[PDB]
Amino acid sequence: MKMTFFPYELKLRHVFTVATYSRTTTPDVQVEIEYEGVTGYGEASMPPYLGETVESVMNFLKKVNLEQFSDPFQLEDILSYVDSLSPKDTAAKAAVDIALHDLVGKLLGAPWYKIWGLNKEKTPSTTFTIGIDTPDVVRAKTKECAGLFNILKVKLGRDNDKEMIETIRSVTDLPIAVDANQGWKDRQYALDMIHWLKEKGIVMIEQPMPKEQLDDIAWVTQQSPLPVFADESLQRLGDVAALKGAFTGINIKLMKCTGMREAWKMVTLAHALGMRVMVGCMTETSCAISAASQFSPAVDFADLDGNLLISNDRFKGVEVVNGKITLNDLPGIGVMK
Amino acid sequence: MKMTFFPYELKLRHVFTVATYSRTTTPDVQVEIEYEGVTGYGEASMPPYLGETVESVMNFLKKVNLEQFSDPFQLEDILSYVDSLSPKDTAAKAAVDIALHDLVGKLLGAPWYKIWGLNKEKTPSTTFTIGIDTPDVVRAKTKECAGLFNILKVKLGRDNDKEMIETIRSVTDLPIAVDANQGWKDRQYALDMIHWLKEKGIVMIEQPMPKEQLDDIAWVTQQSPLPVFADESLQRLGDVAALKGAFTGINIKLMKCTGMREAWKMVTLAHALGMRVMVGCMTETSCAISAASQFSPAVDFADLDGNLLISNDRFKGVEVVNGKITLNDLPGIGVMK
Ligand SMILES: [Mg+2]
Ligand SMILES: [Mg+2]
């Protein structure tokens, strides 16, 4: 089979903020794998702060030899080989993984949620983000979207956390999921900041402290009234077991774990250890978002709005209907170029 | 879909003996699930010393309502519903799981090893047992089948252990895997054994001492020269994690874990936790044997010779070739009635 790839920068509709960073674009590489007339689509999204770039991803993909593989169904052997080409480049490896499942699914004539034996009717509601701004700009956007979602996401980990909730909580009573994003470097300042939110309608807390301080995080979890989910603290399958106890659940993202195959294994592992599972995303096109939505029926929370934040999506895949992630019946990852 | 099932006693070629129980037959129920003209085959084998019977199985299967399910692909929902019908009955449950996978594979037009993305060329060599008897006989049968296998299985933990090995070892140099069955009581006594056996060409120890003494086991394993696998120490997915550090790996049997879906999860979990995996079986037809063989490319050791021990197999499935478990390309579980 043949693989091709090219840079495809994502244009964000509005300033996008993460911790102390902001951007209006996101480096991204689009991947394709052709085989006997069939094409599987893959994608790598690279928020600048995560360490990968157009260059690194393009370089990594140049190092992948797929022509040496005659059977696309050997995802175990093929993706194991891909992983071996470098110690990281998880986003770059995800693009190949995603493209391969798309291809395999197409060849099987089935969506991966089906191949995996899940009920698409059990997909969750996805959160949508309420950016940080002035009490006016805030209540405005909250107003504009509260009618389309069942749960909203707020990126706290800031200074006016208690502020945002109030502003937002004034013009809406929708449950809120907060992502400190490692903003609360303290310990007690984070624990109580949670009982508070819990009193103000928040229903889940994600990545409170920085990954480095696992002791603080762990500590804060058994004393937290709301489920804490690991994000920055977990990258791949081998990082899951070590988080039991420290977190209530894990947040899986294809760009971080290297794709669908490892992601699915993480869902199985997390659950086997009694942990909860949520699925997240970076700003991505409908390619990676749909790929991850394929296993969303098996999770508890989903932050799969990535494609809604960009203006140059090149695929029509999963739609948000009645606030829920909605899978179509297209085979593979479920998108149409 | 319509599920039918009827008793099908397995006739063993020779007296089969385990521990203190000898028999020449095996209670077994054959299951079939029909959907739009496609039929999936399932099976439940019940060694009369493992709690289930033709009755327990037949009654459980009668409590199963599948006509309420319009979509065979919903394996998660369906098998979850089947598991909820009772606290045990794993064999009866495994039968429904197996038939459902066969059906789904057939509808997808692919074998499960392929759906799971494995390389069929990586199937393992399977063992065959050299029962206990007199030197002439031991050395006899040992020579009658050593030409067709690459590894032989021997149930130790008895009084005639040290000499049983030397007997077989006298007429063959084939590596040996031993199944102690919680035999060795003294923990120091068992550790020395693994040393003597490894000296006599043994490459694997299965369930050395009792399960209620995981402590001694863990002790032995941390310093054992050979990998130790758990069999009696576990039954289902939920029991796997509780063996990490104590055992080198786990042995999976469809009749105990309720089938393929859970088995596949067990393989993922064990590997995720750094443990090894092996797959076994009860005396069964090629239905259950081929079903389990579908994920054998992902295991380290395999004892999949069940069908070879019976004289009334109803299916043609995986074959032993050059000592290797050999998968064919038939969809589903890989069998032909
Ligand atoms: Mg996050
Ligand atoms: Mg055994």
Curated annotation (Swiss-Prot), chains A, B:
Q: Which cofactor does it need?
A: Mg(2+)
Span-the-membrane segments of this chain are none
Catalysed reactions, semicolon-separated: L-alanyl-L-glutamate = L-alanyl-D-glutamate
Name a GO molecular-function annotation: magnesium ion binding
| SMART domains in UniProt | MR_MLE
Coiled-coil stretches are none
Binding-site list for substrate = R23, Y49, K153, V154, K155, K253, C281, M282, T283, D303, L304, D305
Recorded E.C. number(s)? 5.1.1.20
Q: What additional remark is attached to this entry?
A: Part of a large, functionally divergent protein family. Protein modeling and substrate docking were used to predict the substrate specificity, prior to biochemical analysis.
What protein name is recorded for this chain?
L-Ala-D/L-Glu epimerase
